[PDB]
Structure formats: structure tokens, C-alpha cells
Design a protein around this nucleic acid. Structure first.
Lengths: 248, 106, 109, 66, 51
DNA sequence: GGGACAAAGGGCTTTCAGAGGAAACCCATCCG
DNA sequence: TTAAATAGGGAAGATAAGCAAAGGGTTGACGAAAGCCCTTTGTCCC
RNA sequence: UUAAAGAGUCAACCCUUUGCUUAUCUUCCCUAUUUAAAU
């Protein structure tokens, strides 16, 4: 809770709205945690936590039956019948504008970080989308908990995701509690033996399924503790927030 | 009248729905990108060229150029690495198609 | 000035091939549209393009096939491809059927 | 490195449980296509289409404070 | 060619259709002057012709 | 020249199966 | 180019009658996993 | 970082008819006074 960097009003087009087989819409916090990890490994700067807020979002299409994207022949098994309307294999798309906050541990200077971040953002992606435009990053300094409200308020205006936990399961909680599920981690099922077609022959491979937790959307000025709005990697392949379950 | 991009959506209260972003007409990025790579002039006939795709085909017209007549992306790709090189047009097509993304397999 | 979409309803006949005995009935459809206002006579279409390098870098697999392909390639002329890609934008092919009916098209890059 | 896959119980369970609870905040997706009898056994019989949660967040309305 | 206002449909199934004449034009025998003008006029107007 | 295997490609294809169903939500502050 | 000082109490707000009928709501394209046959290429045997 | 990839396109007559309408009391009451040389 020392150094934060803010990038607000980032326009991304063509975001992959399909996060799982039952969740279509906002990417989960895992996507932003992976983006932060990619920034850390590529840039060489340790990043602690990531916070994301939704300024605008819209899934392409209508209220129901979102959309279908046309496919093309790109495999080496055809050539005779590859002339008319390849099959679908549906994949939804959406368009959104977000705002990001990154917890950074860097004290060498004050202006080099802005340049190094701007260099990475110009060639980065958000859930497969392309970044159209963004504002100039700026750095905020927090020494204690009381001034954390200022760096929190620096993110206006946007809607931040907070964690409320699961009671029984997402299906019953969504109808009763009126919240929306989200993916917070993966559970391993069984180890991959054949390492031929994998993208890496050194990293161990696993079959995993998403684990669901229920979240809520809150205005930035209405957040009690800012530590509840920051996400980071946890134990047993999970993503958790610093402040735990959000309580009013 | 202007012509923004359309969408393929399951039957709804409308019969023709146009793409928009918060009430303003816009065009899809795939449609913009398709017109940029319409440079495939390097085949036997059919002036007014088409877009570069593996097994270069135009599903709107129902015809598929670069059919099974020993001029494909995969045939040229296999022949280039297996000794004999290609002509200028073949490399200019293979590189242009590799600039376009995609997964090749089977 | 931004251009909205709006929705309208049209009426007509039924002209479908293979159904001649049902051509005396009506047809009601609901569609969308988009057109310039009556005080404006110019359509402005604005967008951005990004060109990046790092070609010949496979995303999935390739330790010897990709290197052999890269060595076989890179002797081609990228100048023609770059000229054609820029010309498809400058000449005005990036904008579709909105092209017809225009007596003057100006491109600012 | 992980390869995510879907769960068969969740789709059928959620569809059956939510169709009778009147939750009108969901999408509808159909698998298979023109011939959905070659994908699974659940898709062949449940031709109406599986249900997915609509996770569209609230958006900041413009021309005002927030 | 029909008028839904009057409820009557001319050019019915009596060997005078757009699709019949268009199909017969490419299959050997040509059309007359009035038929050619009708086909050209109906092609200037849009529509879908296939099925 | 004959037999076997694999791969690629096309075509003769063609085998396989099958009618549910009902409706517009979340939410009010920094800054010049 | 002025200092202060106040600005009404009471009553009360209508009822009845009726809101039309008829006609129509489109088509075309978006399959995987095999069986058989033929051809070509390559390997091995005779 | 559910990473990598993808043209929705084309076409349309909404027409026809019409009586809103009858009645009515806003009444009473009242202290605006007190000065100073033209800059």
C-alpha cells in the first residue's frame, strides 16, 4: 500500500466475452491478474495487486442470443468442400472501456515508471481485445490507511468489483441474494502425460475446471476499505482479495 | 442513407439490426480489416483481386480460387522448406498470408 | 454530429421463388436504418490502424519447422506488400458500399 | 499450464433449476448447429439451448455527475 | 406483379413470371422486347432471387 | 509387374437423428 | 444617495354518457465420423 | 493469459370514416411617519 499507478479511460474493442460455459460478459479477475503478471515478467517490475473498474461495457447483439462471428477455412484437411460457409463453433464478442489500478513496488525514480508502463500498454491485450486509446498514467503515494481514500477516489468514475463469497452455490444464491457469479480460480483434475502438443515441454500440465464465487459491483466513493477492491494470486490456484469478504 | 455494419443475431423483434456503440452507428473491426488485405492478384486469372486466405475463397460468390490444382498455402509452405525454393509471387503470397493470423493444422 | 440509428416499419408484398399462390398477400417487417440529417451533407468516418512487426514468430509450437520457414523466407520484397496495404486505405477501399453516390472522397491520414 | 474444460452437470442443472424460477437475466446458447446430434447426448435432447449468466455490469451514465 | 390494395395478383402462374422468364432466357430461347424491358426493370429494383 | 502399410485428396457418399415456448434493472460528488 | 417595521384571518372547488371494425408479419447459406473405391508419393518383400 | 484465428449481406405504399356539452354572487377591514445647508 505504498505506490499505485492509475490508467483510466482505456478503450478496448473485440473483448472475448465468453469467460466460461455459463458466464458471458466481464472478464474475471483472473484475466487482470494474468495481465499484471505478464507486465511484471516482461517489464521486470514487481506488481503486487490489480484493481479494475468498468466504465462502459456492451455485449454485441440483443437482449438475448448475443451474436455469432463468421468463421473461415484455415486447417489442412480440406480443399474440395472448403468453398461455402464453414461451421460456427460460437465465440461471443463485446466492447468495453475500463480503468486499471496497479500496485507497484518501485522507488528508483518517479517518471521512468510512466514511460515503461506506456511502452507495455501500447503492445498489450485485454482478454484478446485491441487497445484503442488510454490516458497518460500517473503515480500516487500512500503512507498510511487514511490517505488510501485519496488514491481510491483518484479512480473516479468507475464501478469496482467486490467479493461477497458463496453461501451454498451460485445457482441458488443468484436467485435469492441477487448477485452475479465470477471465476476466481481453477481446480486440477488429472495430470497430462503426453507432452507432444503442449506449448511448453518443461512446465507441468494439468486439466482444470473453473471455481465460481459471487461478486458485486460498487461505486468507488462507496467503498469502505480499499483493501477489499484489490485482487492477487492465492493458495491452491485461486485469486483472492486483501480485505476478504466485503461487509458494509 | 448510410450503411453501417450488420450482425448475425437469432430471430428477435427486428428483421435487420445494425451495429452501434451507445446509440451511434459504427462498423466492426473484422470488416475494416478484411478490406485491407485484398491484394491477392498473384493467381492465374480473375482481375479485381480478392483477400488473402488459405485456400483463397469468396463464400459470397460461391467460388473458391486456389483449389486443388497444386497452388495452395500448405503446398507452397511444404515445398519451400523441402529444398527447392519458390518464385517471387509465391513467397509474396506466403509471407502476406503469414502476416494474417490463424491456426494451421490437421 | 453523431448519427443515431432509429427503427421503422415497412409494408410490402411477398415475392418468394417457388410460392406463386401466396403472392396476393401483404408483408409487414420491422427494420433499422441510418441516414444523414437534412442539414448535413457530409459523412465522416474515423478510425485507427496499428502495424506491428515480430513476424516469423509462432505462437504455438515450432522449433525446427518455423526456423526453416524463416530461413527460406525473408528474401521476399516487403515493399510491394506495404505499398498495397497502405493503398487499400488511401484509395478508399476500407469503406464499403457507402462509396457509391459520392462525387468527392477525401482521405486524411 | 492449464487446459480449461466445461462441466456437464452445471449446464443441465442450472438450466433445469433456472427455467422454473423466472430469472430473466440470462442468455441462451445452442450447441451443435444444423446437426446437433454429433456433439453430445445432452445437446441432442436439450435442443432448446443451454442458459448462461448475463454478467453485464452497470455502466456510468453520461451527461451528469455519475 | 400484384396489388395488395386491390387484392388481385397479376402475372400469376400462367407462364408470365420474373423467375420463369429469367430462367428461360439463359436456357436457350431469348425473350421479346417487352419481356426484356420487364426483366431489366425488375433487376434495377432489388430483391432476392434464389431457392 | 504383384502383395502389405501409412499419408494426402476427391468422389460413390451416407449414416445419424428430431417441435420447446414465453416478459424493459441499478442507482445521487470534487474541484477550481 | 438612511437608520427600523410589519405584509390577515374564515368558507369551497359538480354531476352524467361513450373510446370502432377489417387485412397481412418471407425467403437462401453456415456437419462430424466414418465405410468404400481410385490415384499419387514413400518404405519393405516376392 | 478459456492464450493464438475469422465480411452478414440483399428487397418493401399503412391506408379509410367522425358534433363534446349543459348550469353559476367572491365577499367583508385598515394612520406610513421621523429629520437634514449645493461641492
Amino acid at each position: 500500500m505504498r505506490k499505485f499507478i492509475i490508467v483510466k479511460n482505456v478503450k478496448v474493442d473485440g473483448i472475448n466475452a465468453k469467460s466460461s460455459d455459463i458466464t458471458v460478459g466481464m472478464p474475471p479477475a483472473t484475466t487482470f491478474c494474468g495481465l499484471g503478471e505478464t507486465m511484471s515478467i516482461k517489464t521486470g517490475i514487481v506488481v503486487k495487486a490489480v484493481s479494475y473498474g468498468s466504465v462502459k461495457f456492451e455485449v454485441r447483439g440483443s437482449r438475448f442470443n448475443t451474436s455469432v462471428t463468421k468463421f473461415a477455412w484455415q486447417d489442412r484437411g480440406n480443399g474440395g468442400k472448403a468453398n461455402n460457409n464453414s461451421p460456427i463453433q460460437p465465440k461471443p464478442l463485446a466492447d468495453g472501456v475500463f480503468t486499471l489500478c496497479f500496485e507497484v513496488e518501485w522507488e528508483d525514480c518517479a517518471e521512468v515508471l510512466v514511460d515503461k508502463v506506456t511502452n507495455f500498454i501500447n503492445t498489450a491485450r485485454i482478454a484478446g481485445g485491441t487497445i484503442a486509446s488510454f490516458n497518460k498514467p500517473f503515480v500516487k503515494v500512500a503512507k498510511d490507511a487514511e490517505e488510501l481514500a485519496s488514491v481510491k477516489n483518484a479512480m473516479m468514475p468507475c464501478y469496482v468489483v467486490v467479493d461477497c463469497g458463496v453461501e451454498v452455490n451460485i445457482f441458488e444464491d443468484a436467485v435469492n441474494r441477487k448477485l452475479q457469479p465470477m471465476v476466481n480460480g481453477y481446480k486440477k483434475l488429472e495430470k497430462i502425460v503426453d507432452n507432444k502438443h503442449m506449448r511448453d515441454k518443461f512446465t507441468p500440465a494439468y486439466l482444470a475446471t473453473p471455481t465460481y464465487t459471487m461478486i458485486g459491483y460498487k461505486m468507488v466513493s462507496n467503498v469502505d476499505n480499499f483493501d477489499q477492491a484489490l485482487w492477487q494470486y492465492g493458495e491452491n490456484t485461486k485469486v483472492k482479495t486483501i480485505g476478504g469478504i466485503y461487509n458494509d | 442513407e448510410v450503411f453501417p455494419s450488420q450482425e448475425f443475431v437469432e430471430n428477435s423483434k427486428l428483421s435487420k439490426q445494425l451495429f452501434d456503440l451507445n446509440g451511434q452507428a459504427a462498423m466492426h473491426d473484422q470488416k475494416i480489416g478484411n478490406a485491407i488485405r485484398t491484394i491477392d492478384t498473384w493467381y492465374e486469372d480473375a482481375t479485381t483481386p480478392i483477400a488473402v486466405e488459405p485456400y483463397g475463397s469468396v463464400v459470397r460468390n460461391g467460388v473458391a480460387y486456389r483449389a486443388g490444382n497444386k497452388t495452395d498455402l500448405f503446398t507452397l509452405m511444404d515445398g519451400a522448406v523441402n529444398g527447392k525454393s519458390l518464385t517471387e509471387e509465391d513467397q509474396m503470397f506466403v509471407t502476406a498470408n503469414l502476416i494474417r493470423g490463424g491456426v494451421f493444422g490437421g | 454530429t453523431a448519427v443515431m440509428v432509429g427503427t421503422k416499419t415497412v409494408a410490402g408484398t411477398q415475392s418468394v421463388r417457388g410460392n406463386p399462390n401466396d403472392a396476393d398477400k401483404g408483408n409487414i417487417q420491422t427494420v433499422n436504418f441510418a441516414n444523414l440529417p437534412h442539414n448535413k451533407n457530409t459523412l465522416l468516418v474515423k478510425y485507427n490502424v496499428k502495424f506491428v512487426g515480430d513476424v516469423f514468430k509462432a505462437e504455438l509450437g515450432g522449433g525446427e519447422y518455423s526456423n526453416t520457414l524463416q530461413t527460406a523466407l525473408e528474401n521476399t520484397d516487403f515493399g510491394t506488400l506495404a505499398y498495397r496495404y497502405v493503398y487499400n486505405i488511401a484509395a478508399g477501399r476500407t469503406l464499403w458500399r457507402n462509396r457509391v453516390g459520392a462525387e468527392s472522397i477525401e482521405t486524411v491520414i | 499450464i492449464l487446459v480449461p474444460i466445461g462441466n456437464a452437470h452445471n449446464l443441465i442443472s442450472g438450466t433445469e433449476y433456472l427455467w422454473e424460477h423466472k430469472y430473466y437475466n440470462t442468455f441462451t446458447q445452442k450447441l451443435g448447429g444444423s446437426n446437433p446430434q454429433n456433439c453430445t447426448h445432452a445437446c441432442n435432447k436439450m435442443r432448446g439451448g443451454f442458459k448462461q449468466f448475463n454478467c453485464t455490469p452497470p455502466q456510468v451514465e453520461d451527461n451528469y455527475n455519475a
